[PDB]
Specification:
Entry title: refined crystal structure of the influenza virus N9 neuraminidase-NC41 FAB complex
CATH superfamily of chain B: Immunoglobulins
Bound molecules: a molecule of 6 linked components (NAG-NAG-BMA-MAN-MAN-MAN), a molecule of 2 linked components (NAG-NAG), 2-acetamido-2-deoxy-beta-D-glucopyranose, calcium ion
Keywords: hydrolase(O-glycosyl)
Number of domains of chain A: 1
Radius of gyration of chain B: 13 Å
Oligomer: part of a larger assembly
Radius of gyration of chain A: 19 Å
Number of strands of chain B: 10
Order of helices and strands of chain A: EHEEEEEEEEEEEEEEEEEEEEEEE
Organism of A, C, D: Influenza A virus
Strand order of the largest sheet of chain B: 2-10-9-4-5-6
Distance between the termini of chain A: 48 Å
Chains A, C, D: influenza a subtype N9 neuraminidase
CATH topology of chain B: Immunoglobulin-like
Number of helices of chain A: 1
PDB class: hydrolase(o-glycosyl)
Shape of chain B: globular
């Protein structure tokens, strides 16, 4: 738009989910110059929506594809390309260089943030309107990381959640507030949340909600609500017995809102949730131990209730298929009375579980919500690891 | 492989005079010639690289030269301690090939 | 912009360097239709920044890739493509035809200059706004050459440094002054500089500085300052003992400002420097004899002092990795109080040192400056010469 | 422009020629998805210049490339793509369908004309502003053909030269006058010219000149001047002893202006010339018998004099290299006092002379004129027929 954006509306009634995008990248990738990527997400300009992902700088067939299990390297690049196309060498747009990133449009231009580095000397540069504007350096010197979803903006202020520190210990999280690439304020994590990683954020009614990952002790996600108007936040865990991190212990009958729910430690997988009272939907992998299957379950008042069990569901990826990271996105410039709620699921293929190939990679599925109660299908990446041999 | 040919193998010059050691490659090595000196019962010291540039601290008596396939290392005011085995390595393409050496004897 | 550009600002404090772009061309190139190139550089339009390079007219896998060591041929083409993509057959924009070039935007349209030819009958045609406007022919008949970086414009006047003559002798350099593709004036080299090649230029405060290469005797670079308002210039060498050409003798303790610093003759490699008193940064290869490693060293008052040793540094390419040509570029239309200082380093791969393949080629790394003192990483081209066999 | 174009200017002094474009298509084509084409030409929009050519609907490596010697088939398509890129599957723009074509911009939109068909039931459809506007059918039922260069427009009127009939006999040529795709008038060939084929046209001073091919008896080209204001024309042969068709008898000392110059019959190759008194330049292959070499020779008052021998020349393609079709084009929207004179030469590779491959194809070289007397180079297609085996 020619003007900043204010999150004036609220969510619409989630009643089922409809397919929004499917890139089919590994399937096509067996014969085109599709790029090896991982950690995808989706973000909308006022004018178009694109798929964003962290490239590994090689084609899946190319011989340099071997060994892409490694998360960070200096051949990683944050790219974007059209909605539902593959990340193709000949049409991805490189957004900045690094191995962690967030990106989001404030209404006028967009901010992209790519962290790069040695694990003890990492540095973020905050690009705004395709130009490098600001740069922040490592405060705790052990892997500076950020979202791997899109950030939400309000009146020019876009809060962004950064964690430097240990993924096995206390880390040192901090909410930063950008307006037009400059740092308005930054404040330390606060609330009962014990450790924050890979936050998934959606905005409604001038408040932004993030649903993250506690790597350390959590099997129940930390929720951070941020107030972009006053530049304040708080964190807590989701009260529901319906545990959504992966791995996890099997769901209790009573859950935990002010501490990690004890069971699977030093591990997790990025995720999201739409937190809205009666209209709360949580996403989770089906396997208690592996990223296979993805489902969306309606768990009313999940955030606040230590007894909330589901009341409606939908299957996105079967348990016999692989899934991965997921996060929230919305089209803030979509004409409506309300905000359509969307999510994406990353579909990992390769190493370590399909180690007959030496590359890891992924495709994407994304859904948005419908108020109709539509029928469900289940959406496989689709490639046969045997044709790459 | 590029082939450095050193002939002659022995050289005698008197103390205070000039000697010159000739080296030659089997194709234009575009001046990428290094000269080492191996003092008897010691390791080589790099004297010159890029045919004529002295390494840090080989005193200007040593004058590298040449072009194409034909290079030469001149030494003046020859010292009784100049006695050593002189080798040219080439440094244009891998693998880095040496010469047979030339023993500079003091008359 | 709809109006010419004046270099009104000055440089910003260089305090460390952040990655601006990395194309990963040879790595990707093992499996896409990435073009064989060499002599790259970067230049900014008021609206976007792109990578420019001299194409050899073949894909790196294509069989015609063999023998691209030769600098000049009639299959060379100056191309551009998006920042941080590979030079792909399906997205490079051919700018003009020839084997030497400069290009730069004056604020309104851009000028590109490609020299073509037999070595004794060479001819430059000065394209302006993608149309051929002027043409200059060889004055000394032995290889007419120009910058291989971008030129800087001021009020429509863009000085350009052309050298025809011997790279082993006295050559015949001359500064030309273009406005809108037409030749405003041209004047002969003047100053104490003995021989000029491949000038790197940045503009600030209505003056343009070029840091070049003395092929003949220099191991210390000639600096030309040009006054685009009065169309005047002078040249000198950089006073510092910190020698920056490659090959070079090892750095003295006292350097030389009005003559070449004696040691490695008939050779060099294109380079740059930001010359600004306390805030002077010089770039150099690490090897005294080969294009491997690249580092940026802060040498206060380098230009004027025959005793300036460094006070802060940063490693760009390790000495175990290959480098090559480097030059300055800046985004003159970047909104700020000042000019962000940037450079690029070309990363040669192929012949002659990796002669197991018969092609020479390269990728690009580029940095811009930050005032924060960020951590450093080291940025390898990245391909394995063994997967192309 | 937002307004039709009038050819108000005249040519500029041709004093030498400079390279304007070189696509390097067969060289690149050994490893990208470059399309097999033949009969190229170049045409300018008020906003950009592109290469146009008749595609054969296959990639040069693709197995359907074999047998592209055949001129007409229903897999032929007139395409365009950016100046100096290859005709790539992923960036050519298909202009209309058929095996003969002309295209040209009238100032507002452009007209493209593609003839398609059985050799006895052929049909032209005159596209204007990328929509099919008019269609003309075969008047003589034996291969309806047109220019294979660009047409010139004046005040909306663009004359176009169409020949249906025998290439071995009298054929039935006719000048058609389009304005905005509609047929303003059409008139039969008139003048002393005996047979017209593949006309090359440039416009200056509100008159358009075409230099064509007499297939039947000519070895000296028919020149048609057309008056786009009054929709009238006349034809004659070029008076000069310098014979420019190919094959040809060796040049006489006295030439022929009102009849074919007797010698090589039932054959020719498309060509051009800039006809302007003292400033006349004629192009010809060097071989009297084969399309090898191309040269530009200044033959003052060539059109009108039966004794005009050359006074200055320039070599474009050596006699040891292959050439082919050539034609004129100009940038009518190029800002100047005058019209820059340009031409293109098609560089055929394949069958029949390089029959070790089963495809025929080509690349392009194009020049424009300079008033400086620049040095000359010679511009080979460049591919090695041996790497395709
Ligand atoms: C046409 O399409 C429509 C529209 O989609 C179809 O209707 C939909 O059909 C869905 C499936 O039939 C249905 O979903 C179900 O909804 C109920 C609510 O009534 C919900 O409970 C279900 O969710 C649980 O069950 C699934 C498997 O069935 C589990 O994977 C899921 O995790 C939920 O159970 C787990 O957690 C619960 C809460 O804590 C526990 O109580 C439970 O014991 C279970 O625990 C285990 O699983 C966990 C994960 O594996 C693990 O962590 C834990 O530790 C335990 O091991 C389910 O979503 C939709 O409600 C329905 N929607 C609509 C609008 O009708 C329709 O059928 C289609 N028609 C045809 C003809 O095909
Ligand atoms: C996290 O990141 C930060 C930020 O980057 C790290 O801090 C930076 O760390 C840098 C390296 O540790 C440091 O650079 C050094 O700065 C000093 C100034 O105090 C500077 O002297 C150094 O530069 C010389 O040394 C390097 C190798 O160390 C040489 O390659 C270089 O050429 C310079 O030396 C040569 O020239 C000198 C001048 O003439 C001579 O005096 C010297 O003898 C030497 O000569 C030889 O080398 C030449 C080239 O090979 C050759 O021509 C000559 O003939 C001789 O053979 C170096 O740059 C930064 O200052 C520092 N920056 C900041 C803001 O702190 C931090 O350590 C990281 N943290 C962790 C935990 O990893
Ligand atoms: C640096 O670059 C500059 C700029 O380009 C160089 O200068 C240019 O150099 C050109 C070649 O040296 C020179 O061209 C010549 O100009 C003369 C005018 O003085 C012109 O006559 C020449 O053209 C004839 O000769 C060529 C071969 O030399 C033939 O291929 C051509 O067809 C012309 O001859 C044929 O037709 C004539 C007319 O009828 C006949 O009189 C003649 O007998 C001949 O006949 C045979 O050939 C025909 C085709 O093969 C065939 O049909 C016929 O039947 C017969 O078999 C030539 O173009 C430029 O004038 C000159 N320009 C400038 C501005 O100086 C400079 O040398 C370069 N410098 C260096 C150091 O390299
Ligand atoms: C790259 O891929 C190759 C296969 O393309 C891997 O090769 C194996 O590597 C091990 C050592 O890790 C060798 O001993 C095996 O014999 C290789 N054999 C097979 C069948 O793959 C290589 O390790 C991969 N990893 C990297 C980082 O290059
Ligand atoms: C082109 O590449 C080929 C290899 O693809 C080169 O071939 C070698 O060339 C020499 C002569 O220079 C032959 O005697 C060797 O037997 C060839 N063998 C090998 C293993 O490469 C060729 O020289 C290259 N250069 C050019 C300009 O074509
Ligand atoms: C298509 O290309 C093939 C080769 O790819 C041509 O094959 C030859 O065709 C003749 C008949 O014309 C056979 O008798 C030969 O034995 C074939 N051999 C070779 C070595 O090419 C084929 O003719 C081409 N033409 C068409 C129109 O398909
Ligand atoms: C956006 O919201 C702020 C308060 O958060 C308000 O002052 C501003 O004027 C709003 N602008 C628009 C276009 O809604
Ligand atoms: C640019 O600078 C010149 C003097 O160099 C001045 O006369 C001209 O008006 C300036 N234009 C702008 C927009 O600054
Ligand atoms: C173009 O030329 C015609 C006469 O040929 C004239 O009447 C018309 O007004 C001219 N238009 C322009 C813009 O020159
Ligand atoms: Ca956990
Ligand atoms: Ca030098
Ligand atoms: Ca004829």
């Amino acid at each position: 738009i020619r003007e900043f954006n204010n999150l004036t509306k609220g969510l619409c009634t989630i009643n089922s989910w409809h397919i929004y995008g499917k890139d089919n990248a590994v399937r096509i990738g067996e014969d085109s110059d599709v790029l090896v990527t991982r950690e995808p997400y989706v973000s909308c300009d006022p004018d178009e929506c694109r798929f964003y992902a962290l490239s590994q700088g090689t084609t899946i067939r190319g011989k340099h594809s071997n060994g892409t299990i490694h998360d960070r390297s200096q051949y990683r690049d944050l790219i974007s390309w059209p909605l539902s196309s593959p990340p193709t060498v000949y049409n991805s747009r490189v957004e900045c260089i690094g191995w962690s990133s967030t990106s989001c449009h404030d209404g006028r231009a967009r901010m992209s943030i790519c962290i790069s580095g040695p694990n003890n000397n990492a540095s973020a540069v905050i690009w705004y309107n395709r130009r490098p504007v600001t740069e922040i350096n490592t405060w705790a010197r052990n892997i500076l990381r950020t979202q791997e979803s899109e950030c939400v903006c309000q009146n020019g202020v876009c809060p962004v959640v950064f964690t430097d520190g240990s993924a096995t210990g206390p880390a040192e999280t901090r909410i930063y507030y950008f307006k037009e690439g400059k740092i308005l304020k930054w404040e330390p994590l606060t609330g009962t949340a014990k450790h924050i990683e890979e936050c998934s954020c959606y905005g409604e009614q001038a408040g932004v909600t993030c649903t993250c990952r506690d790597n350390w002790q959590g099997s129940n996600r930390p929720v951070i609500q941020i107030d972009p108007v006053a530049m304040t936040h708080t964190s807590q865990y989701i009260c529901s017995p319906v545990l959504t991190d992966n791995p996890r212990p099997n769901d209790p009958t009573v859950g935990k809102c002010n501490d990690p729910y004890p069971g699977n430690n030093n591990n997790g997988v990025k995720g999201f949730s739409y937190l809205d009272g009666g209209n709360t939907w949580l996403g989770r992998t089906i396997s208690i131990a592996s990223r296979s299957g993805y489902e969306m379950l309606k768990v009313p008042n999940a955030l606040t209730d230590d007894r909330s069990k589901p009341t409606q569901g939908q299957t996105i990826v079967l348990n016999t298929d692989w899934s991965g990271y997921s996060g929230s996105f919305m089209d803030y410039w979509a004409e409506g009375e309300c905000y359509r709620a969307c999510f994406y699921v990353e579909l990992i293929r390769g190493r370590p579980k399909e180690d007959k190939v030496w590359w890891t990679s992924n495709s994407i599925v994304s859904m948005c919500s419908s108020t109709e109660f539509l029928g469900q299908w289940n959406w496989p990446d689709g490639a046969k690891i045997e044709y790459f041999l | 492989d590029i082939v450095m040919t050193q002939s002659p193998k022995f050289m005698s010059t008197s103390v205070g005079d000039r000697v010159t050691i000739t080296c030659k490659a089997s194709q234009d090595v575009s001046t990428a010639v290094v000269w080492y000196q191996q003092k008897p019962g010691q390791s080589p010291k790099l004297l010159i690289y890029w045919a004529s540039t002295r390494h840090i601290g080989v005193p200007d008596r040593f004058a590298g030269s040449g072009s194409g396939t034909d290079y030469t290392l001149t030494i003046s005011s020859v010292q009784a301690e100049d006695l050593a085995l002189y080798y040219c390595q080439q440094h244009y393409s891998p693998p880095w090939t040496f010469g047979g050496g030339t023993k500079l004897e003091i008359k």
